[PDB]
């Protein structure tokens, strides 16, 4: 059924599964018109399809052109996600298609489910986790390719860089989500922490600095400290 | 006017005929129901005084033969049977009338209620949903499950209602995924009406029969079937105006007839708020809407 802290370590077993985060598919700015009415201007967006076990991310860039002359665009965004997720599965060889797709937002259940009718043995599941995938556009290199695109485009990444060479998927996925949680709650500080030291660099084929084991620990502790500070500020605790 | 005689009444039982019902005491001299209007389907049904569980009953139409009821002590229930000997039947019916042991189908003459609840219900269709073709009449009870309910065990005893499922291949044309799922007109009009039912009267007949089985036997899957057939229409942007008008009459008399105390299990909160207030057809059910608001405002 739904995914919560009870059945958490399932993410890392050997059943292929994908997460689908749709929060950044439809992205607008809100501005005032000459007549003083409000209007929206859409910018390029993306679907955040992620295999928590391997790091493989299927960044499906959504070009503003797809909204042209359409109504109820937020409702449509959900169906475009499910249409793109479905064509991604179909594009993959059978032994690579996922056995479960977990949507980060229950509103995706019905559009995915309908688009996956060709795949009755693929379980579409909601989650009760509060995952921070929306902060994915705080990753400079993912925001950069989204914003530069001039057409629909799929860009493949490993979101764990080379971490798995030294840590488990479990640990990778917790480092990922700590980082993204920190990027969500206070982007400016989070990014300060990651980059202060100019002597720790991002390999051209990587998303995050090439921290050593010892440096990741210091980073992880700073990120934790950031997130606990921001909570106290939010709630006056 | 037709007659359904009873051989005896060995056990205390509440007897229903259509929307009317009578208490009958153990081995009270009761020998049947007279003056039943020819021209419509009818359902005679039963609830034993000892076992308020399992309401059961038989759909029938008098034009199709001479039917009577006989208690069966091995099986413990009132069984409908057919007398093929015409003379021997009129002989029994005449003598019980002379002895006046039969209640009279108590129809007020202003009342179209039973006509309106059964307008499109035809016995030939009833016998395809309840397949048991050695009998002209059709047995249903509380616990019978439907074909859809069996998919998600004994098919001899199944209610073979038409399977409706909004998230199926049937209902969703490839490439119109979003369109067909927010606007079911395709499913309703081409797949179901033109495809399977052939015409709206057969659709409405199934819907009405599902409703009566829910109401007279609290058959849970029949209740699910009615709601499904209502939902499909209310969720279709494009419906023949004559269907919308007849539906509005149909539901009105169903809402009207329903026991006030059962509105908690027989009426699905979500389907009805969607039909009356969210769907394409929100503004098309003026009689149903008005009657639902004044009688069951709480459900809404």
Swiss-Prot record, chain A:
The record's region (RNase H homology domain) falls at: 7-237
Subcellular location per UniProt equals:
Nucleus
| Outcome of mutating residue 21 to N | Reduced growth at 30 degrees Celsius. Strongly reduced growth at 16 degrees Celsius
Q: List the disulfide bonds.
A: none
Q: Which domain of life is it from?
A: Eukaryota
What note about domains is in the entry?
A: The MPN (JAB/Mov34) domain has structural similarity with deubiquitinating enzymes, but lacks the residues that would bind the catalytic metal ion. Contains a region with structural similarity to reverse transcriptase, presenting the classical thumb, fingers and palm architecture, but lacks enzyme activity, since the essential metal-binding residues are not conserved.
Q: What does this protein do?
A: Functions as a scaffold that mediates the ordered assembly of spliceosomal proteins and snRNAs. Required for association of BRR2 with the spliceosomal U5 snRNP, and the subsequent assembly of the U4/U6-U5 tri-snRNP complex. Functions as a scaffold that positions spliceosomal U2, U5 and U6 snRNAs at splice sites on pre-mRNA substrates, so that splicing can occur. Interacts with both the 5' and the 3' splice site, as well as the branch region. Has a role in branch site-3' splice site selection. Associates with the branch site-3' splice 3'-exon region. Also has a role in cell cycle.
List other remarks.
Answer: Present with 468 molecules/cell in log phase SD medium.
Q: How does it assemble?
A: Component of the U4/U6-U5 tri-snRNP complex composed of the U4, U6 and U5 snRNAs and at least PRP3, PRP4, PRP6, PRP8, PRP18, PRP31, PRP38, SNU13, SNU23, SNU66, SNU114, SPP381, SMB1, SMD1, SMD2, SMD3, SMX2, SMX3, LSM2, LSM3, LSM4, LSM5, LSM6, LSM7, LSM8, BRR2 and DIB1.
- Name of protein: Pre-mRNA-splicing factor 8
Q: Specify the species.
A: Saccharomyces cerevisiae (strain ATCC 204508 / S288c) (Baker's yeast)
UniProtKB/Swiss-Prot annotation, chain B:
> What keywords sit in the KW lines?
Cytoplasm, mRNA processing, mRNA splicing, Nucleus, Phosphoprotein
Residues where Phosphoserine occurs? Answer: 236
Asked if Nucleus is a keyword of the record, the answer is yes
Please name the Gene3D superfamilies in this protein's record: 2.60.34.20, Aar2, C-terminal domain-like
Where does this polypeptide localize?
A: Cytoplasm; Nucleus
PTM per UniProt? Phosphorylated on serine and tyrosine residues.
Which effect does the record note for changing residue 236 to D/E? Answer: Disrupts interaction with PRP8
What family, per the record? Answer: Belongs to the AAR2 family.
Oligomeric and partner information: Heterodimer. Interacts with PRP8 (via RNase H homology domain and MPN domain), competing with BRR2 for the same binding site. Component of a U5 snRNP complex that contains at least the U5 snRNA, PRP8, SNU114, AAR2, SMB1, SMD1, SMD2, SMD3, SME1, SMX2 and SMX3, but is not a component of the U4/U6-U5 tri-snRNP complex.
Name assigned to this protein: A1 cistron-splicing factor AAR2
Q: What is the lineage of its organism?
A: Eukaryota, Fungi, Dikarya, Ascomycota, Saccharomycotina
- Gene transcribed to yield this protein: AAR2
């Amino acid at each position: 059924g739904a995914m919560n802290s009870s059945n958490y370590a399932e993410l890392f077993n050997n059943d292929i599964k994908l997460f689908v985060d749709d929060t950044n598919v439809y992205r607008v700015t809100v501005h005032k018109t000459f007549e003083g009415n409000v209007a929206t201007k859409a910018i390029n967006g993306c679907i955040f399809t992620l295999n928590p076990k391997t790091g493989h991310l299927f960044l499906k860039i959504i070009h503003t052109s797809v909204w042209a002359g359409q109504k109820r665009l937020s409702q449509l965004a959900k169906w475009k996600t499910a249409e793109e997720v479905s064509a991604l599965v179909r594009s993959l060889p059978k032994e690579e298609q996922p056995k479960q797709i977990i949507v980060t937002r229950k509103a995706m259940l019905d559009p995915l489910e309908v688009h996956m009718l060709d795949f009755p043995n693929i379980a579409i599941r909601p989650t009760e986790l509060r995952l921070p995938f929306s902060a994915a556009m705080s990753i400079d290199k993912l925001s950069d390719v989204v914003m530069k695109a001039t057409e629909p485009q799929m860009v493949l990444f490993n979101i764990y860089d080379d971490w798995l060479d030294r840590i488990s998927s479990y640990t990778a996925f917790s480092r990922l989500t700590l980082l993204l949680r920190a990027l969500k709650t206070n982007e400016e500080s989070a990014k300060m922490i990651l980059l202060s030291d100019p002597t720790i660099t991002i390999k051209s084929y990587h998303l995050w600095p090439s921290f050593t084991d010892e440096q990741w620990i210091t980073i992880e502790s700073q990120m934790r400290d950031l997130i606990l500070t921001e909570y106290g500020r939010k709630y006056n605790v | 006017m037709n007659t359904v005689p009873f051989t005896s009444a060995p056990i205390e039982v509440t007897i229903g005929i259509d929307q009317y019902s009578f208490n009958v005491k153990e081995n009270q001299p009761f020998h049947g129901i007279k003056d039943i209007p020819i021209g419509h389907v009818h359902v005679i049904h039963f609830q034993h005084a000892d076992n308020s569980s399992m309401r059961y009953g038989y759909w029938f139409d008098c034009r199709m033969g001479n039917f009577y009821i006989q208690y069966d002590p091995k099986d413990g229930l009132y069984k409908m049977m057919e007398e093929r000997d015409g003379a021997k039947f009129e002989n029994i019916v005449h003598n019980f009338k002379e002895r006046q042991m039969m209640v009279s189908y108590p129809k007020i003459d202003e009342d179209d209620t039973w006509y309106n609840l059964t307008e499109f219900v035809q016995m030939d269709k009833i016998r395809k949903i309840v397949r048991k073709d050695e009998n002209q009449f059709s047995y249903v009870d509380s616990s019978m499950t439907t074909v859809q309910e069996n998919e998600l065990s004994d098919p001899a005893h199944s209610l073979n209602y038409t399977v409706i499922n909004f998230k199926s291949r049937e209902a969703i044309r490839p490439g119109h995924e979003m369109e067909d799922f927010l606007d079911k007109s395709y499913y309703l009009n081409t797949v179901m009406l033109q495809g399977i039912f052939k015409n709206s009267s057969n659709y409405f007949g199934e819907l009405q029969f599902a409703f009566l089985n829910a109401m007279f036997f609290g058959n849970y899957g029949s209740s699910l079937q009615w709601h499904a057939m209502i939902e499909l229409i209310c969720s279709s942007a494009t419906v023949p105006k004559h269907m919308l008008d007849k539906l509005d009459e149909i539901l009105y008399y169903q809402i009207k007839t329903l026991p006030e105390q059962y509105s908690d299990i027989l009426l699905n909160e979500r389907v009805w708020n969607i039909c009356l207030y969210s769907s394409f057809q929100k503004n098309s059910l003026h009689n149903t809407e008005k009657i639902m608001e004044n009688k069951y405002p709480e459900l809404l």
